[PDB]
Amino acid sequence: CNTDQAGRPKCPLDPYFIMPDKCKCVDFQTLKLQELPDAVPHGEMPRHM
């Protein structure tokens, strides 16, 4: 805890909590992509990303 406190007693260890109602949020998505069948080498399993 980064507060100047002289004479006062001090904060304990690991005193921080995340406030959810005071945060900025954005959309998030994950996709799975496969190699084109037109370009997959003969006799080889397709790769993913």
Binding site: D14, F17, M19, P20, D21, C23, C25, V26, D27
Partner: protein
């Protein structure tokens, strides 16, 4: 914490604005009577139209839609103030009251697929179906303890979701005294509130074809615990918030989003008295005639459908015996006689109507099933189509294609109206009182006139006895009848909705006369409006008639006459056998006709109409 706030312009002004909003003294507002109704009914929440608020105060509506929590707190404070004002005694029972929301939200009307982070911390509306529900669980709010060693009682207050973020100092259950004397919990004096969690999915009818569905999770508080069930179509209005994860050092930065419900909705006198008392017989006469203008002729089928809509009377006795009161009909006819149109109209008009074709649903999906819950290992019951349609209508198109086992299963519903279910570990008797419509094609594609109806129908006598009525429809190619049919069809085709420009792409008791939908000749008569028809049908269904002594002997003598005429009917064949169920059918149709005209007792005319229907349906040339 000794920190307090002395002044806050925004909160005080918002509270004042809501105080002026809910006054209803110099205005035509109704909320005062709403509050009085709430006091009368011991309920503790209110529903307020959003459009009304926007009309009265647009800025407050904008702020409430954009910012939810603080404005909702101000609403609740104002409710507490006015409940104290009107009756301070009643406000003592409950800690704080709550606010519901209603009206057209407009842009915020959002599908489960289109909910995004842009709507966070705002009030949103969502339409969906319910898929998962959980058991009701109590939660502690105020705890009370007693110390036998020192004869002292203490109380602790809990507030977890009241504040946005909680700390380890709170939510601690006390067990020991200051001098380590044991404390005894006293559950009677504590305070608990119920809690439930449900899941909502986007309806398959609305989702894009071929794509996976998306769902939202909802928390139901103490009041709204029992308002939802799985497999139900609902609309939920509430806040959309983030979920605080428990304490840790390293965070990935992804929250969980949960919708906290505030409103849950299941989507759905003088005139009646005068009309009934004046018309009597003309009531059912016009109702049969004005059943569906889109369908030509077939007065008997319209009468039978009306009898289904009104129905019989359920009766119970001392010994626990049950007597059926529902009616059942089967229609068989040539193609293009508009059987499916009739089924669709009954689906639209009836309150609880479910369509289930022949092979669309199997025997398991019709009645019910038992499944072993993997989460707990217990056995649970899942209701089928017929159990959901309690005191309702099930429509079965292409009834002939249904398999034998499904019909044997339907026997239990058709005879007694109950379903018995059993698997080792659980057994139950579920209620399934229902009425059935069915349409089946003839076996030869087209009905053969020369052959007797038994060969054409191809159904056993037991199943035929299960049904109250059988009807046969034919497409006779009379030139004048064809002319009438063509006139009617093309009149309906050329019609256009009023108020719509030509060439564009895409309540009074009696309906206004129309030049095309009715015709010039029909000016001497009128048709009944749909809304009044539904209201009258509901009122008639409520009414409970009684059978008279005059008609009982008459009906019994006619039943004996029919069973003797069994030998007299030599020129014509019989569609259905005459069993003991025929007498109950007679009484049921008599009571349905007595329901049609609001009265107190069953008369002879209803018996005569029932007997005419029976004579027409049971024999054919």
């Amino acid at each position: 914490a000794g920190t307090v706030v002395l002044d806050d312009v925004e909160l005080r002004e918002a509270q004042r604005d809501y105080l002026d909003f809910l006054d209803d003294e110099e205005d035509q507002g109704i909320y005062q009577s709403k509050v009085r109704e709430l006091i009368s009914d011991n309920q503790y929440r209110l529903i307020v139209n959003v459009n009304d608020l926007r009309r009265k105060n647009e800025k407050r509506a904008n702020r409430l839609l954009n910012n939810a929590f603080e404005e909702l707190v101000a609403f609740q404070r104002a409710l507490k103030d006015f409940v104290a004002s009107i009756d301070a005694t009643y406000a003592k029972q409950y800690e704080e009251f709550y606010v519901g929301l209603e009206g057209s939200f407009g842009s915020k009307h959002v599908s489960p697929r289109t909910l995004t982070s842009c709507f966070l911390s705002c009030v949103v509306c969502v339409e969906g179906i319910v898929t998962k529900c959980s058991l009701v669980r109590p939660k502690v709010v105020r705890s009370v303890h007693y110390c036998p060693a020192t004869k002292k009682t203490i109380e602790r207050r809990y507030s977890d979701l009241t504040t946005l973020v909680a700390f380890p100092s709170s939510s601690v259950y006390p067990t020991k005294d200051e001098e380590n004397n044991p404390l005894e919990t006293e559950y009677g004096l504590s305070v608990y509130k119920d809690h439930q969690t449900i899941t909502i999915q986007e309806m398959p009818e609305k989702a894009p074809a071929g794509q996976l569905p998306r769902s939202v999770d909802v928390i139901l508080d103490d009041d709204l615990v029992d308002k939802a069930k799985p497999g139900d179509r609902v609309q939920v209005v509430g806040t959309y918030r983030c979920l605080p994860g428990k304490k840790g050092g390293y965070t990935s930065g992804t929250f969980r989003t949960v919708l906290i419900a505030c409103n849950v909705k299941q989507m759905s006198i003088a005139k009646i008295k005068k009309f009934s008392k004046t018309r009597s017989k003309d009531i059912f006469d016009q109702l049969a005639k004005s059943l569906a203008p889109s369908i030509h002729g077939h007065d008997y089928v319209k009468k039978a459908i009306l009898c289904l809509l009104l129905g019989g009377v359920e009766r119970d006795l001392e010994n626990g015996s049950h007597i059926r009161g529902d009616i059942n009909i089967l229609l068989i006819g040539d193609p293009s006689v508009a059987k499916s149109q009739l089924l669709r109209y009954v689906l639209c008009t009836a309150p609880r109507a479910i369509p289930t074709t022949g092979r669309g649903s199997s025997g398991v999906g019709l009645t019910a099933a038992v499944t072993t819950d993997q989460e707990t290992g217990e056995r649970r019951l899942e209701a089928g189509a017929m159990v959901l349609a309690d005191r309702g209508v099930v429509c079965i198109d292409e009834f002939d294609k249904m398999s034998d086992m499904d019909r044997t299963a339907i026997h239990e519903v058709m005879e007694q109206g109950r379903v018995t279910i059993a698997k080792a570990g659980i057994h139950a008797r579920l209620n399934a009182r229902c009425s059935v419509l069915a349409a089946a094609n003839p076996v030869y594609g087209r009905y053969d006139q020369y052959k007797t109806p038994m060969e054409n129908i191809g159904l056993q006598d037991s199943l035929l006895s299960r049904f109250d009525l059988l009807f046969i429809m034919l497409d006779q190619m009379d030139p004048e009848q064809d002319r009438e049919i063509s006139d009617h069809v093309l009149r309906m085709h050329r019609y256009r909705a009023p108020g719509e420009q030509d060439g564009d792409a895409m309540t009074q008791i009696y309906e206004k006369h129309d030049n095309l939908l009715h015709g010039t000749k029909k000016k001497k008569e009128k048709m009944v409006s749909a809304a009044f028809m539904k209201k009258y049908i509901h009122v008639a269904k409520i009414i409970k008639p009684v059978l008279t002594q005059e008609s009982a002997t008459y009906i019994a003598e006619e039943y004996s006459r029919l069973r003797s005429q069994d030998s007299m009917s030599s020129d014509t064949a019989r569609t259905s056998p005459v069993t003991a169920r025929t007498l109950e059918t007679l009484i049921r149709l008599a009571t349905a006709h007595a329901k049609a005209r609001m009265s107190k007792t069953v008369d002879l005319q209803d018996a005569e109409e029932a007997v005419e229907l029976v004579q027409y349906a049971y024999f054919k040339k």
